[PDB]
């Protein structure tokens, strides 16, 4: 069971890796505490297939507060994924970075947020606008130090009406707690 799942996840075959990821997702959704296998799934993180990457990101987000120490092995992966040419991959990485409830992980994510703040992709712009608000809610001092308020203010005065609306909502949420 657990040993078999770990062996399957530590295999070099993508066909078994996908099945193991699906089984792990089902066990967590079925009500199984799969947080003990978070470090095992950490090795199988950088994958070309987008289907397994989403499941891994969801497991990390749902298994971030439980094992914050074991989450220290994902900053490099997030940094690498923050520059993917596909806008969807970058948006997913930005969403996962802001969803990670780690105090020692948000500090190193300031650079990717700054890089994605001026993203040309409207989906990337919206993802960065959401991530900035999430970081401010998690850490107001870090957000203020990063100087994201100026970028958010100029976001409303840019193109992409959906991105402008998202930036306005993030600014309202930040000012609501301000």
């Amino acid at each position: 069971e657990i040993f078999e799942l770990k062996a399957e996840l530590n295999s070099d075959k993508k066909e078994k890796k996908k099945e193991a990821v699906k089984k792990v997702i089902a066990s967590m959704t079925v009500g199984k505490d799969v947080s003990a296998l978070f470090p095992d799934v950490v090795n199988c993180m950088q994958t070309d297939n987008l289907e397994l990457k989403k499941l891994v990101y969801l497991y990390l987000m749902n298994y971030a507060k439980s094992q914050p120490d074991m989450a220290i092995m994902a900053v490099n992966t997030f940094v690498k994924d923050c520059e993917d040419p596909n806008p969807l991959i970058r948006a997913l990485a930005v969403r996962t970075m802001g969803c990670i409830r780690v105090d020692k992980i948000t500090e190193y994510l300031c650079e990717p947020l700054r890089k994605c703040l001026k993203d040309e992709d409207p989906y990337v712009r919206k993802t960065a606008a959401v991530c900035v608000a999430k970081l401010h809610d998690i850490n107001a001092q870090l957000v203020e130090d990063q100087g994201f308020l100026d970028t958010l203010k100029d976001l409303i005065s840019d193109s992409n009406p959906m991105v402008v609306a998202n930036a306005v909502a993030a600014l309202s949420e930040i000012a609501e707690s301000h």
Binding site: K22, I25, A26, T29, G31, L50, E51, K54, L55, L58, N62, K65, N86, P87, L88, A91, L92, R95, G98, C99, R101, D121, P122, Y123, K126, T127, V130, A133, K134, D137, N160, P161, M162, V163, N166, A169, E173
Partner: protein
């Protein structure tokens, strides 16, 4: 500002959960079921719950109640709108709303939940547009979501350009037991199934009373629609300026506009029912239905629901036209008529038994509801004038539209 949107089951098991802000612990869902049971058992059950400092505002679906946790003073209306959009998306993706698909389509369900709402703020809700980015059987997101037109995907090509319209009428009548109708409102429903090539900009034109008055033709039959609810594709500014209905139709079936005006005309069906219920001996149902609608129109599938006694047994029906069946599950006499010509008069004489022993508690008087649906009948008299289908390439469209008249909240108060 929902903290975590979760999907429960009929036994209290959470089918799926997806936290968006994490401000509420996932263990608070355990008290949701007992709280709902206490509210229902004490009459305090409401769609918005409250577990201490966290509120559980959600609605009940076909098989599960979508409970979305929240902690701050989030917009309850926004939460309800997000829940409705999620239900519509699930219905579009999954033909059935039951636990059979929740445990079978988790791979796509999780992706849809993650993409739909981020940090409690939904961003994408178009099922047709969303079907091009998340599939259950990933390329870059389509430019429609980023572009202003998020309801008309570009590049759509069809062999023909046919748009099917559906002017669905809802005759709602609130007739009191004294014989007077209190709530008599008719709500128009313009549902169109646009299937063309490209992204045409429809120019809707009808015989509105306001438009006729503005143009100076306020002398013919003009629809006085009190409320007009345009769709997302319809430009609000164009309608506000000079009643210009200009919008880009989408690919598929969608609701463009929803008229709603009061009705001051005679009812299409007049029901004269009598209750000769003896005191624990017998009961009589002298029900007479008079069709006040036009004789040229036929009400297909007329279903006048007559609430019979709950404990009544051994019933006999003496009617004139239409199949009369008593459903023990519904506890009422179903006056089912296949075709009802306009001006027809159906007379019924019911006779059912009753136990000698009186019931322990009263059961109330359910209202009599008619299920008449007469197609090709426009009670409001509103007629479509024109539909300006304009495309950059240039093509000859073949628009189509049909008028269907049915009964909405057409219930008759019992005596």
């Amino acid at each position: 500002s929902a903290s975590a949107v979760y999907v429960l089951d009929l036994k209290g098991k959470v089918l799926i959960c997806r936290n968006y802000r994490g401000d509420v612990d996932m263990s608070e869902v355990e008290h949701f079921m007992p709280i709902l049971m206490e509210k229902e058992e004490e009459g305090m059950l409401s769609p918005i719950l409250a577990h201490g400092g966290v509120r559980f505002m959600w609605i009940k679906h076909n098989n599960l109640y979508l409970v979305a946790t929240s902690k701050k003073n989030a917009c309850v209306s926004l939460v309800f709108s997000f829940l409705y959009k999620v239900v519509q998306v699930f219905s579009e993706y999954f033909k059935e709303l039951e636990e059979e698909s929740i445990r079978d389509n988790f791979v796509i369900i999780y992706e849809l939940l993650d993409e739909l709402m981020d940090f409690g703020y939904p961003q994408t809700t178009d099922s047709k547009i969303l079907q091009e980015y998340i599939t259950q059987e990933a390329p870059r997101p389509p430019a429609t979501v980023t572009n202003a037109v998020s309801w008309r995907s570009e590049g759509i090509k069809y062999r023909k350009n046919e748009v099917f319209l559906d002017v669905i009428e809802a005759v709602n009548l609130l007739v009191s037991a004294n014989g007077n109708v209190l709530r008599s409102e008719i709500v128009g429903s313009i549902k169109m199934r646009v299937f063309l090539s490209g992204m045409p900009e429809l120019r809707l034109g009808l015989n509105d009373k306001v438009l006729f008055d503005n143009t100076g033709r306020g002398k013919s039959k003009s629809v006085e629609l009190e409320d007009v609810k345009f769709h997302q594709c319809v430009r609000l500014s164009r309608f506000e300026n000079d009643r210009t209905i200009s919008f880009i139709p989408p690919d598929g079936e969608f609701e463009l506009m929803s008229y709603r005006l009061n009705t001051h005309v005679k009812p299409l069906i007049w029901i004269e029912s009598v209750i000769e219920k003896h005191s624990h001996s017998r009961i009589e149902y002298m029900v007479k239905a008079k069709s006040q609608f036009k004789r040229r129109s036929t009400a297909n599938n007329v279903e006048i629901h007559i609430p019979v006694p709950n404990d009544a047994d051994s019933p006999k029906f003496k009617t004139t036209v239409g199949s009369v069946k008593w459903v023990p599950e519904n506890s009422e006499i179903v006056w089912s008529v296949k075709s009802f010509p306009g001006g027809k008069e159906y007379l019924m004489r019911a006779h059912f038994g009753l136990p000698s022993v009186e019931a322990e508690d009263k059961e109330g008087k359910p209202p009599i509801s008619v299920k008449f649906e007469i197609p090709y009948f426009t009670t409001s008299g509103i007629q479509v004038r024109y539909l300006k289908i304009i495309e950059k390439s240039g093509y000859q469209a073949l628009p189509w539209v049909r008028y269907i008249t049915q009964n909405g909240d057409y219930q008759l108060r019992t005596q």
